[PDB]
Amino acid sequence: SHGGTTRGILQIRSDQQQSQHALENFKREWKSSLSGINGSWQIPVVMADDIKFVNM
Amino acid sequence: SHGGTTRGILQIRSDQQQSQHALENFKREWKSSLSGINGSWQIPVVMADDIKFVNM
Amino acid sequence: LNYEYPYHPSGNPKHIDVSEIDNLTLADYGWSPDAVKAYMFGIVVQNPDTGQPMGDEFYNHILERAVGKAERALDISILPDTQHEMRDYHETEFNSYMFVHAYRKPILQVENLQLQFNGRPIYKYPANWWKVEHLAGHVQLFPTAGATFAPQMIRLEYVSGMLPRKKAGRNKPWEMPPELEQLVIKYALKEIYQVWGNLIIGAGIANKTLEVDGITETIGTTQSAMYGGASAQILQINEDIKELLDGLRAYFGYNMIGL
Amino acid sequence: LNYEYPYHPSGNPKHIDVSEIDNLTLADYGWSPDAVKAYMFGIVVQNPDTGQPMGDEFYNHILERAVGKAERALDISILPDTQHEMRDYHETEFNSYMFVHAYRKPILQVENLQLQFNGRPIYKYPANWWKVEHLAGHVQLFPTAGATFAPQMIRLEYVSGMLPRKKAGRNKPWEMPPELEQLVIKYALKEIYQVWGNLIIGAGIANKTLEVDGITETIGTTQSAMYGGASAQILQINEDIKELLDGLRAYFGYNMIGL
Amino acid sequence: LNYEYPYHPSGNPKHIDVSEIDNLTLADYGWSPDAVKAYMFGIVVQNPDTGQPMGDEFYNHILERAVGKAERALDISILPDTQHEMRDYHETEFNSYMFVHAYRKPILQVENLQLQFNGRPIYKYPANWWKVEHLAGHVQLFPTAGATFAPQMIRLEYVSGMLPRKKAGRNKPWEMPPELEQLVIKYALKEIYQVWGNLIIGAGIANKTLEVDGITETIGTTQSAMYGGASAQILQINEDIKELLDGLRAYFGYNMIGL
Amino acid sequence: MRDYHETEFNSYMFVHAYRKPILQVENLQLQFNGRPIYKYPANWWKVEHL
């Protein structure tokens, strides 16, 4: 009813944070490539300097 | 039907990546020496600077 | 609504005429020898023995290569050009509203989009279906109404590039950012400084003394057996480039693909 | 209540006239050659051979590019401009009171907001429903009364930018912070100092002595084979920039998106 | 559709005539002694005892080896050449639309493709089936309609290489990037600077003083017991090479193979 | 104009001002499309200035 069920945060890090526009079209690439049953077994390749996932 | 069943990536690393020709005749040495029942218990010796296997 | 057919004003508005793509020149973006000289105000580069100044030909050469370097440094298309792509069918992205990522970005406009078989159009999508996101390089369809992939089914023709910005300090997503111009300037300037750093003194001179008949002159110079005459300026320009590239690689996003 | 239609005084108060966005200029924000000269009190930059001082053209050029650098350094819109965005439908955020994040911030005002289909308005939301958070760049609706996403369903027109602050020492969330002006000044100043640092002495000179008929003059300088003539000032300006950017990136928040 | 047989306009468009591959020369790509001299504006290389300048023979030699170095530094073919390959059958890639990766890239065009047995053509694939991706170096078939490998079943003849770019600042995927030219230039320049750095002063001289009858002359030079006279320039050129190679190794992809 | 959040609204209508210190509170209202739904009596307002 009220909780945060969020599993965790995907930390991507570079010299500066991406602009909101860049991040929103990255969200579009993500959902258009990986969401639902249609995307279910594909793996994204990403070339950020470092990537971390924090379990909450 | 759609997934990547790929167990992992064999990372070989040296001062520079091999040319495509070199890599394809390395694939020929590999399959001609190690594939199927015929190769089944042989172990390759490789002298790259470092070799790593990432489990996916 | 009435419009020139492909350029439906919501999904694919016309931003350039296919005649203007021939008329644009480097000087229209402010990339000119005078701009470089402005950044080297109070300096002149001239042949020490011949006295002739360095000609603008070398400047324009350096600028064209600086634009090329900038276009690979950021995965972008700067000068307008017509792109013709044959793109692979992939089932996941085809189900995702026929998602295709263009190889070159920004999109100025999409010119054609077809599903084909041996060059035969199997279907031509109505232009009112085309959804374009210009800076992203994304095209999608939103229809009004035995293998997971196959090669080169989709034919996509479009113009990539940027237009010179129309207002001071501001750019639309299809307009050039004000400081990408300055980045290209800095790249040119770094080569011009490498040339100039040879000529402040005779070749290879790092100290001189002359004494004649009670007159003495002695000059020390920024050249040395380690540092060239413009080492300092080049270092500074490299710092500025670093900051600029950080900002612009924050403006354009991280590249990604799903496998 | 009576108001100019879109500008409901609680949810979307009018902050600028759509004619004023054309009338504003850099000098209205205090970015002027005189401001730079003020920060270079007691220095003059002049062509070593021609003696003429450097013209205001270069000042205004540098200022426009410094504003561009600042606008990418912080993910903000400084000078007022009219923004037209086509935004994707996503079910999670559409259920969250029709949440949309603008690409550009601050919002000066929202001009139009519609849900459409092939350019056909499906619904036009009453302006009394529009909820705007100006500095965040957030818009929401609080109505008075087959896929999880779809492209470009939402049409949003708004003005992004900042107004010059109306009181000394103070700014509203849509007004420019007093020291973002100084940050842009510092960016300009760094280029003017890079140019000027070539001219303190003849080109490439790092020591000189002249002796004639028992009269001697000798000058050592802050130039060296490593550091250019204005290294110190540039370093200091970089420090000031660092502090200012820390403060302003505390004022503007971290970017985030939900996937 | 009608075309010269192999050059199906969708899958294998003609980019060069097999007679033109003889007519192209290094100078057509701008690699010329004059270009080097341009990058050494204000320097002249001449025999210290004989006075004669260094001949263009050495320039062209160095340029050809710089092209060779560039072609191995990036796994690419620059100058057009006719390639004849015998390729292994592998079941996984043969099932994948007869996927083959060429040893040399870009593909300008495919000239022949056959499956054979002791030189006898077992099948000749219709040219309308050939799917070529030029910059990738990939060839596939899209048919219109006891072991995992066997040696040399597939006979593939094609032309690899790049054409000189037709527009300023722009290149098609089969055209040379403007700054790969500059990379080859920089390599040549680096060799010419290594030659020149011996001759700026007499052999082994790093300081001199001469005093005669109350006249004194004294020269310090960029030579030293550590650094040769052009150390600085070579270091700078190495930096530029590093940046260029970063960009071009981002333009061309990572090599991969499936085992 | 401040968002309603259930947790903090239940916590004695807690709101954190964007700007601090508070010299004084001038008005505090719950509203709907600019119509005051309720105006809280000024004797209810509790301010912590710093």
Coordinates of C-alpha atoms in Angstrom, one line a residue, chain D:
Chain D
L1 CA -10.8 34.8 -11.0
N2 CA -9.7 36.5 -14.2
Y3 CA -6.4 36.0 -16.0
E4 CA -4.8 35.6 -19.4
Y5 CA -6.1 32.2 -20.2
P6 CA -3.2 29.8 -19.8
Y7 CA -1.6 31.7 -16.9
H8 CA -3.8 30.6 -14.0
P9 CA -2.3 32.6 -11.1
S10 CA -1.9 29.6 -8.7
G11 CA -0.8 26.7 -10.9
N12 CA 0.8 28.5 -13.9
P13 CA 1.4 32.2 -13.0
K14 CA 2.7 34.4 -15.9
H15 CA 6.3 35.3 -15.5
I16 CA 7.2 36.7 -19.0
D17 CA 5.5 38.0 -22.0
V18 CA 6.1 36.1 -25.3
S19 CA 7.2 39.4 -26.8
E20 CA 9.8 40.0 -24.0
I21 CA 11.7 36.8 -24.9
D22 CA 12.8 38.5 -28.1
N23 CA 13.7 41.7 -26.3
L24 CA 16.1 40.3 -23.7
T25 CA 19.9 40.6 -24.4
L26 CA 23.1 39.5 -22.7
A27 CA 23.7 43.1 -21.4
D28 CA 20.4 42.9 -19.5
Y29 CA 22.0 40.2 -17.4
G30 CA 25.2 42.3 -16.9
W31 CA 27.3 40.3 -19.3
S32 CA 29.1 43.2 -20.9
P33 CA 32.6 44.1 -22.0
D34 CA 32.6 46.7 -19.2
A35 CA 32.1 44.0 -16.6
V36 CA 35.1 42.1 -17.9
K37 CA 37.2 45.3 -18.0
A38 CA 36.1 45.9 -14.4
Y39 CA 37.5 42.5 -13.4
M40 CA 40.7 43.5 -15.3
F41 CA 41.0 46.9 -13.7
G42 CA 44.5 48.3 -14.4
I43 CA 45.2 46.0 -17.3
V44 CA 44.8 46.9 -21.0
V45 CA 45.0 44.4 -23.9
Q46 CA 46.3 45.9 -27.1
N47 CA 47.8 44.7 -30.4
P48 CA 51.6 44.8 -29.9
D49 CA 52.3 46.1 -33.4
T50 CA 49.2 48.1 -34.0
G51 CA 48.7 49.6 -30.5
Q52 CA 44.9 49.4 -30.9
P53 CA 43.0 47.9 -27.9
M54 CA 41.1 44.6 -28.4
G55 CA 37.6 45.3 -29.7
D56 CA 34.3 44.5 -28.1
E57 CA 33.6 42.0 -30.8
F58 CA 35.9 39.4 -29.2
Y59 CA 34.4 40.2 -25.8
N60 CA 30.8 39.5 -27.0
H61 CA 32.0 36.4 -28.9
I62 CA 33.7 35.0 -25.8
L63 CA 30.7 35.8 -23.6
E64 CA 28.3 34.0 -25.9
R65 CA 30.4 30.9 -25.9
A66 CA 30.9 31.1 -22.1
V67 CA 27.1 31.2 -21.8
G68 CA 26.9 28.1 -23.9
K69 CA 29.6 26.3 -21.8
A70 CA 27.6 27.3 -18.7
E71 CA 24.4 26.0 -20.1
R72 CA 25.9 22.6 -20.7
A73 CA 28.0 22.6 -17.5
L74 CA 24.7 22.8 -15.5
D75 CA 21.7 21.1 -17.2
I76 CA 19.8 24.4 -17.4
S77 CA 18.4 26.9 -19.7
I78 CA 19.6 30.4 -19.1
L79 CA 18.3 32.8 -21.8
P80 CA 14.5 32.5 -22.4
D81 CA 13.5 30.4 -25.3
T82 CA 10.3 28.8 -26.6
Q83 CA 10.5 25.0 -26.2
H84 CA 8.2 22.6 -28.1
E85 CA 8.5 18.9 -27.0
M86 CA 6.8 15.7 -28.1
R87 CA 6.9 13.3 -25.2
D88 CA 6.4 9.6 -24.9
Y89 CA 3.6 8.0 -23.0
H90 CA 4.8 5.7 -20.2
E91 CA 2.1 4.0 -18.2
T92 CA 3.8 4.3 -14.8
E93 CA 4.3 8.0 -15.0
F94 CA 1.1 8.7 -16.8
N95 CA -0.8 7.1 -13.9
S96 CA 1.3 9.3 -11.5
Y97 CA -0.8 12.4 -12.2
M98 CA 0.4 12.6 -15.8
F99 CA 3.9 13.3 -14.7
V100 CA 6.3 14.7 -17.3
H101 CA 9.8 16.0 -16.8
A102 CA 10.8 18.8 -19.2
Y103 CA 14.1 18.4 -21.1
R104 CA 14.9 22.0 -20.2
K105 CA 14.6 23.8 -16.9
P106 CA 13.7 26.1 -15.2
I107 CA 10.1 26.5 -16.6
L108 CA 9.2 30.2 -16.9
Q109 CA 5.7 29.1 -18.0
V110 CA 3.8 26.4 -19.7
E111 CA 2.1 27.5 -23.0
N112 CA 0.3 24.4 -24.1
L113 CA -0.4 20.8 -23.1
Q114 CA -2.4 18.3 -25.2
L115 CA -2.9 14.6 -25.7
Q116 CA -3.0 13.9 -29.4
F117 CA -3.1 11.2 -32.1
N118 CA -1.5 11.8 -35.5
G119 CA -1.7 15.5 -34.8
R120 CA -5.4 15.2 -33.9
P121 CA -6.0 16.6 -30.4
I122 CA -7.6 13.8 -28.5
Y123 CA -8.0 16.0 -25.3
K124 CA -7.0 19.5 -24.4
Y125 CA -6.5 19.7 -20.6
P126 CA -8.1 22.8 -18.9
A127 CA -5.4 25.2 -17.8
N128 CA -6.8 25.1 -14.2
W129 CA -5.5 21.5 -14.1
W130 CA -1.9 22.3 -14.9
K131 CA 0.5 22.0 -12.0
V132 CA 3.9 23.4 -12.6
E133 CA 7.1 23.2 -10.5
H134 CA 9.3 25.8 -12.1
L135 CA 12.9 25.1 -10.9
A136 CA 12.4 21.3 -11.0
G137 CA 11.0 21.2 -14.5
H138 CA 8.0 19.1 -13.5
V139 CA 4.4 19.3 -14.8
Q140 CA 1.5 17.4 -13.5
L141 CA -2.3 17.3 -13.8
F142 CA -4.7 17.3 -10.8
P143 CA -8.1 16.9 -12.6
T144 CA -10.8 19.1 -11.1
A145 CA -13.6 17.4 -13.1
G146 CA -2.2 -2.7 -25.1
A147 CA 1.4 -1.6 -24.4
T148 CA 3.2 -0.1 -21.5
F149 CA 4.6 2.8 -23.6
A150 CA 3.9 4.6 -26.8
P151 CA 5.8 7.3 -28.7
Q152 CA 5.1 11.0 -28.8
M153 CA 1.5 10.9 -27.5
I154 CA 1.9 14.0 -25.4
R155 CA 2.4 17.5 -26.9
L156 CA 4.0 20.0 -24.5
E157 CA 4.9 23.7 -25.3
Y158 CA 6.5 25.8 -22.7
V159 CA 9.0 28.6 -22.1
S160 CA 12.3 27.6 -20.5
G161 CA 14.8 30.1 -19.1
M162 CA 15.7 32.5 -16.3
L163 CA 14.7 36.1 -15.8
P164 CA 17.2 38.7 -14.4
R165 CA 16.6 39.0 -10.6
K166 CA 14.4 41.8 -9.5
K167 CA 16.0 42.6 -6.1
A168 CA 19.6 43.0 -5.0
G169 CA 21.1 39.9 -3.4
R170 CA 17.9 37.9 -3.9
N171 CA 16.5 35.6 -6.5
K172 CA 13.2 33.8 -7.0
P173 CA 13.5 30.1 -8.2
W174 CA 12.9 31.4 -11.8
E175 CA 15.4 34.2 -11.4
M176 CA 19.1 34.0 -12.2
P177 CA 21.3 33.4 -9.1
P178 CA 23.6 36.5 -8.6
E179 CA 26.8 34.5 -8.9
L180 CA 25.9 32.4 -11.9
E181 CA 26.6 35.8 -13.6
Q182 CA 30.0 35.8 -11.9
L183 CA 30.6 32.2 -13.1
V184 CA 29.9 33.2 -16.7
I185 CA 32.3 36.2 -16.1
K186 CA 35.0 33.9 -14.9
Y187 CA 34.6 31.7 -18.0
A188 CA 35.0 34.7 -20.2
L189 CA 37.9 36.1 -18.1
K190 CA 39.8 32.7 -18.5
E191 CA 39.9 33.1 -22.3
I192 CA 40.8 36.8 -22.2
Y193 CA 43.7 35.9 -19.8
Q194 CA 44.8 33.1 -22.1
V195 CA 45.0 35.6 -25.0
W196 CA 46.6 38.4 -23.0
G197 CA 49.3 36.1 -21.5
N198 CA 51.0 35.9 -24.8
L199 CA 51.5 39.7 -25.0
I200 CA 53.1 40.7 -21.7
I201 CA 56.5 40.3 -23.5
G202 CA 57.5 39.8 -27.1
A203 CA 56.3 36.4 -28.4
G204 CA 58.2 33.5 -26.9
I205 CA 60.5 35.7 -24.8
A206 CA 61.2 34.3 -21.3
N207 CA 64.2 36.4 -20.4
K208 CA 65.9 39.4 -22.0
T209 CA 68.9 41.6 -21.4
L210 CA 70.1 44.6 -23.4
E211 CA 73.3 46.4 -22.6
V212 CA 74.4 49.5 -24.6
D213 CA 77.3 51.8 -23.8
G214 CA 77.3 51.2 -20.1
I215 CA 73.4 51.3 -19.7
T216 CA 71.9 48.0 -18.7
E217 CA 68.3 46.8 -18.6
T218 CA 67.3 43.2 -17.6
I219 CA 63.8 41.7 -17.2
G220 CA 62.9 38.3 -15.8
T221 CA 59.3 37.2 -16.2
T222 CA 56.6 34.8 -14.9
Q223 CA 56.8 32.9 -18.2
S224 CA 58.8 29.7 -18.3
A225 CA 59.1 26.6 -20.5
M226 CA 56.3 25.0 -18.4
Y227 CA 53.9 27.8 -17.3
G228 CA 52.5 30.5 -19.5
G229 CA 52.4 34.1 -18.5
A230 CA 49.0 34.0 -16.9
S231 CA 49.1 30.6 -15.3
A232 CA 48.6 31.9 -11.8
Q233 CA 45.4 33.9 -12.6
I234 CA 44.0 31.0 -14.6
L235 CA 44.6 28.6 -11.7
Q236 CA 42.8 31.0 -9.3
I237 CA 39.9 31.4 -11.7
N238 CA 39.7 27.6 -12.0
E239 CA 39.4 27.4 -8.2
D240 CA 36.6 30.0 -8.2
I241 CA 34.8 28.1 -11.0
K242 CA 35.1 24.9 -9.0
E243 CA 33.6 26.4 -5.9
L244 CA 30.8 28.1 -7.9
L245 CA 29.9 24.9 -9.7
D246 CA 29.9 23.0 -6.4
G247 CA 27.4 25.4 -5.0
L248 CA 25.2 25.5 -8.1
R249 CA 25.2 21.7 -8.5
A250 CA 23.9 21.8 -4.9
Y251 CA 21.3 24.3 -6.0
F252 CA 20.2 22.2 -9.0
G253 CA 19.6 18.6 -8.1
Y254 CA 20.8 15.2 -9.3
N255 CA 19.2 13.9 -12.4
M256 CA 17.2 10.7 -12.1
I257 CA 14.9 8.4 -14.2
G258 CA 13.0 5.3 -13.4
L259 CA 13.3 2.3 -15.7

